[PDB]
């Protein structure tokens, strides 16, 4: 593997996608990088709202497993055949790897109009793979077949393309220190949030509220999704801290835009260090969570029915190291996360964890 060749290998607020060549001869697809799922799933049939798809009949090396997979959720669905084929990633590798592949033949609201990508690369753990955890994940195939370490890292530069470095850490994608937080459970990239701070003022909440259901790092979620109680506290704190006349109720919930930066507060998320007595904060400036769409803006944070999702809103500010080998998630500030000659994110530490509980994940 060549880590320098993986710099700028993603194309981008509708997702970051990697060019992947599938089958014999190779068919070029554009595949969404998703750290919150574990299946390699692509478009199989000729569907509306997409340019191209993976035709299994054109691949001589394709082999069907003889079974289907179905994923159920509230706002849609997708069904596909499970098979096996050779895959290469041009920007990073120069040899093919045998992987599992789901080919989507029917789906509800999956492929949206005006989206460039036509599949998803699930980079989370075997636990989440469908129909079961025995279906070898793409990254597990890659680690084993490509002789790379069990580590990848991701940088998103949309707010400033991006980079998915498969096998390690590229030193040119960051400056300063990498801070590591432990992976509490290996399914999603679940990490422990200790505190949320708005304009230097902590939310007066139990730290279990941040990890109610789970707190995860997900490149396949657009916004910073917060549980309803945490979301209402953040909105109240941002509204109070903001100098201006109040934002509308519709702005907070995402129904309407705000049209027209020192007037808006910083938002910091404290994460436990590998030493449990210490923590570090990942901080986003207003430029990351008041997102351009008279210039009109949308609120980059949304309410969640279940989990606290550290989505693209936050990941845009940081080079994120998914160190599966050492059971930890690294964070460093992205040099590309810069607008109008000003850094739109910060990282700092250490901070004490003496006031907070030893385990903020409920059990």
């Amino acid at each position, epitope marked *: 593997a060549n880590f320098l060749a993986m710099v700028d290998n993603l194309q981008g607020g509708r997702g970051y996608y990697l060019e992947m060549l599938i089958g014999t001869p190779p068919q070029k697809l554009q595949i969404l990088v998703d750290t919150g799922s574990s299946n390699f799933a692509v478009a199989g049939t000729p569907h509306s709202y997409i340019d191209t798809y993976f035709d299994t009949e054109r691949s001589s*090396t394709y*082999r069907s*497993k*003889g*079974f289907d997979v179905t994923v159920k959720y509230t706002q849609g669905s997708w069904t596909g055949f499970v098979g*096996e084929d*050779l895959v290469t990633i041009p920007k990073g590798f120069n040899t*093919s*790897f*045998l*992987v*599992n592949i789901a080919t989507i033949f029917e789906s509800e609201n999956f492929f949206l109009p005006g989206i460039k990508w036509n599949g998803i690369l699930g980079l989370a*753990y*075997a636990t989440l*793979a469908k129909p079961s*955890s*025995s*279906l*070898e*994940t793409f990254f*597990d*195939s890659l680690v*084993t*077949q*490509a*002789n790379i370490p069990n580590v990848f890292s991701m940088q998103m530069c949309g707010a400033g393309g991006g980079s998915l470095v498969l096998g390690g850490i590229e030193p040119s994608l960051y400056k300063g220190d990498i801070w590591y937080t432990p992976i509490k459970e290996e399914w999603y990239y679940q990490i422990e949030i200790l505190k949320l701070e708005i304009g230097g003022q902590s939310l007066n909440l139990d730290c279990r509220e941040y990890n109610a259901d789970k707190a995860i790092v997900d490149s396949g979620t657009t916004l910073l999704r917060l549980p309803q109680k945490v979301f209402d506290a953040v909105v109240e704190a941002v509204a109070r801290a903001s100098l201006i006349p109040e934002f509308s109720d519709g702005f907070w919930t995402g129904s309407q835009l705000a049209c027209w930066w020192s007037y808006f507060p910083k938002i910091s998320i404290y994460l436990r260090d590998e030493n449990s007595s210490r923590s570090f904060r990942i901080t986003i400036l207003p430029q990351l969570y008041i997102q351009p769409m008279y210039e009109c803006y949308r609120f980059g944070i949304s309410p969640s029915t279940n989990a606290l999702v550290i989505g693209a809103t936050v990941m845009e500010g940081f080079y994120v190291i998914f160190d599966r080998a050492q059971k930890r998630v690294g964070f460093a500030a992205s040099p590309c996360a810069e607008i109008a000659g000003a850094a739109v994110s910060e990282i700092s530490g250490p901070f004490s964890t003496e006031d907070v509980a030893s385990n903020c994940v409920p059990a």
Partner: nanobody
Amino acid sequence: VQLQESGGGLVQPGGSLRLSCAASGFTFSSAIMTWVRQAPGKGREWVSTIGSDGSITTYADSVKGRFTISRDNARNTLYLQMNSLKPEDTAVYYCTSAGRRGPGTQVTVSS
């Protein structure tokens, strides 16, 4: 996903072994199977991968022409036929599938 390797041993240069790996606790007939090797003080090295039906096989350039991967889905067994062995082939050979691995079998080649 339970895996247990066997068939390794001490051989001469130009020798031969036939590794096996018994599988249980999962649908072996639907699983991609891969042999990996690891020697002390050396990097982890992929040997060969075989698809679930056995028709698609891939090999590392270091073993191409000399080693052959195969499987018996009816018997839940993966194989590696090893020919023309040399001292550089000395390692623990283990089978892996879906992020799990077996403890492996020692292959030693020496004069």
